[PDB]
Amino acid sequence: MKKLLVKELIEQFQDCVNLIDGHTNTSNVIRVPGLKRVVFEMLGLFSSQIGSVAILGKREFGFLSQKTLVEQQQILHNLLKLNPPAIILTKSFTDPTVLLQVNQTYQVPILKTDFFSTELSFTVETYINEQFATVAQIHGVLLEVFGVGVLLTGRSGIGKSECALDLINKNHLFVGDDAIEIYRLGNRLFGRAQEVAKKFMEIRGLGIINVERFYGLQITKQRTEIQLMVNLLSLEKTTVTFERLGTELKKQRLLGVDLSFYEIPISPGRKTSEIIESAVIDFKLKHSGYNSALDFIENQKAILKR
Which positions from 220 through 279 interact with its own copies, judged by CB under 8 A?
220-221, 232-236, 242-247, 253, 256-258, 262-275, 277-279
| Catalytic-role residue among 244, 270, 301, 306 | 244
270 is catalytic: no
114 carries an active-site annotation: no
| Region 139-158 residues binding its own copies, contact defined as CB under 8 A | 144, 146-147, 157-158
CA–CA distance, 112 with 117 (Å, rounded to integer): 12
191 is in an annotated binding site: no
Nearer to its own copies, 239 or 300 (CB): 300
Q: Return the residues of window 73-112 that contact its own copies according to CB under 8 A.
A: none
Does residue 178 have an active-site annotation?
yes
Give the count of residues interacting with its own copies (CB under 8 A): 121
Nearer to its own copies, 74 or 292 (CB): 292
Long-range contacts of 185-189 (CB under 8 A, 24+ apart): 185/130, 185/133, 187/257, 188/225, 188/257, 189/225, 189/226, 189/227, 189/254, 189/255, 189/256, 189/257, 189/259
Nearer to its own copies, 69 or 206 (CB): 206
Q: How far apart are CA 96 and CA 118, in angstroms?
A: 20
- Ligand-binding annotation for 202, yes or no, is yes
Picking from 96, 146, 103, 127, the residue whose alpha carbon sits closest to that of residue 16 is 127
Residue 24: CB partners within 8 Å, gap ≥ 6? 107
Active site residue 139: yes
Residues with a known catalytic role? 139, 160, 178, 244
Summarize the annotated binding site for Mg(2+) as residue ranges.
161, 202
